[PDB]
């Protein structure tokens with residue numbers, strides 16, 4: 613690694629380079645992080661269930677540790693995430709009797725959570741994924757069903773962004789989602805964000821999760837999505853990048869190691885992806901990987917539990933993979 617290029621330095625004039633972490637991986641992958649990234653995202657510890665597990669009970673310890681690490685190394689921090697249909701405790705939507713609360717009560721709870729969380733990290737966290745995955749991933753409907761939407765109504769996103777803006781008007785607020793480059797969904801995300809911005813809602817950027825495969829989405833689809841979203845005038849962040857060795861239809865669990873073909877195609881894939889990101893450096897301001905080395909990735913258990921994936925630029929021994937060389941040479 614002595615003579616190895618540093619990711620954040622290579623892309624210094626293009627965009628920040630980030631990694632998703634947790635207290636455990638910060639220790640396990642500390643040197644890689646210190647040598648390559650200038651942005652950090654909490655993989656799980658800033659989600660609702662990990663910040664306010666019970667009403668009035670805030671558990672900022674783990675998030676504080678992540679922020680402390682980032683700040684001690686002059687790394688930016690992306691806040692993830694405030695309002696999402698997943699990883700949110702049941703108490704949030706229920707009353708004493710266990711029945712669903714009213715619109716006003718849920719809005720009060722949403723405002724309280726957002727205000728408390730955002731104000732704590734004001735000045736240390738420069739952006740927040742305010743709304744995560746609200747758009748439907750299947751069907752002809754625009755929005756995915758969720759307790760937030762059911763109880764409050766379809767304007768729940770407008771409210772979330774306004775509450776977050778009030779809490780920290782200097783933060784960049786994002787709508788974050790996956791499968792963001794498939795045409796049908798791209799148009800739903802575009803329509804949603806355009807509608808919000810047309811109402812003056814403080815949504816400053818779109819977060820493209822980029823949980824991609826070797827084949828999907830195509831480079832043309834990625835280019836089209838970047839251009840489509842950029843045309844709204846918002847900032848773009850690639851937020852949870854990883855390149856899975858398995859396509860959606862591939863649920864094999866017996867592969868103990870990736871084939872030389874997988875490794876080679878992944879290298880080509882990462883080179884093509886970063887070449888495209890660099891081309892759009894004027895609108896993309898940050899590229900965060902959902903991890904940093906293959907010794908830790910949520911793809912080991914998703915969508916198939918108990919297997920192994922090799923989605924990042926560094927291997928399990930923290931050594932650069934062929935993908936690393938193609939990525940930094942664009």
Ligand SMILES: O[C@@H]1[C@@H](O)[C@H](O[C@@H]2CO[C@@H](O)[C@H](O)[C@H]2O)OC[C@H]1O
Pocket residue numbers: 655656744790821852910
């Ligand atoms: O440890 C896992 C996390 O890595 C995972 O993170 C999510 C990945 O999918 C994205 O769409 C989400 O935004 C991101 O939070 O969440 C589940 C957890 O078990």
Ligand SMILES: O[C@@H]1[C@@H](O)[C@H](O)OC[C@H]1O
Pocket residue numbers: 790823
């Ligand atoms: O659970 C979600 C999964 O269904 C999607 O494919 O990727 C993002 C995850 O959060």
Ligand code: NA
Pocket residue numbers: 625626627892893894895896897898
């Ligand atoms: Na840029």
